[PDB]
């Protein structure tokens, strides 16, 4: 004889179907993350890492590193050809 109780029965009722499914996905995606640009890790110098933080950086990454690599390759090849040819 008791009336229905919508706001009293919300323990099992969630927000539709998709919103409750994505609530767990969105609650923790924003929890454990850097606030703003933390840990840049820019500093690196290990020849390969020296190239990474010197010319191979993605801020520009223009053809200048490629031209420098080609210049070094042809400089080595000149001596190689002198040895061979």
């Amino acid at each position: 004889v008791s009336t229905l109780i919508p706001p009293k029965v919300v323990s099992s009722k969630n927000i539709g179907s998709a919103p409750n499914a994505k609530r767990i996905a969105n609650v923790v995606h924003f929890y454990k993350s850097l606030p703003q640009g933390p840990a840049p890790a820019i500093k690196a110098n290990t020849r390969l890492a020296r190239y990474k933080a010197k010319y191979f950086d993605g801020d520009n990454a223009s053809g200048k590193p490629l031209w420098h690599f080609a210049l070094g390759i042809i400089a080595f090849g000149y001596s190689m050809e002198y040895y061979f040819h």
Partner: protein, 57 residues
Amino acid sequence: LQSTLDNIQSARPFDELTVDDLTKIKPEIDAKVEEMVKKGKWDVPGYKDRFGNLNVM
């Protein structure tokens, strides 16, 4: 929900977001990679429809 909105809009920029952060936040993406690598389907529907395919050639 209020905390979720606050930390969604107040911080966490996306352009500088790293993939490792996403992997450490949620590991089910790794399981998805396992499951579509083992089944050998690299073109599951819903990959680049909302993103840029840029099929130049």
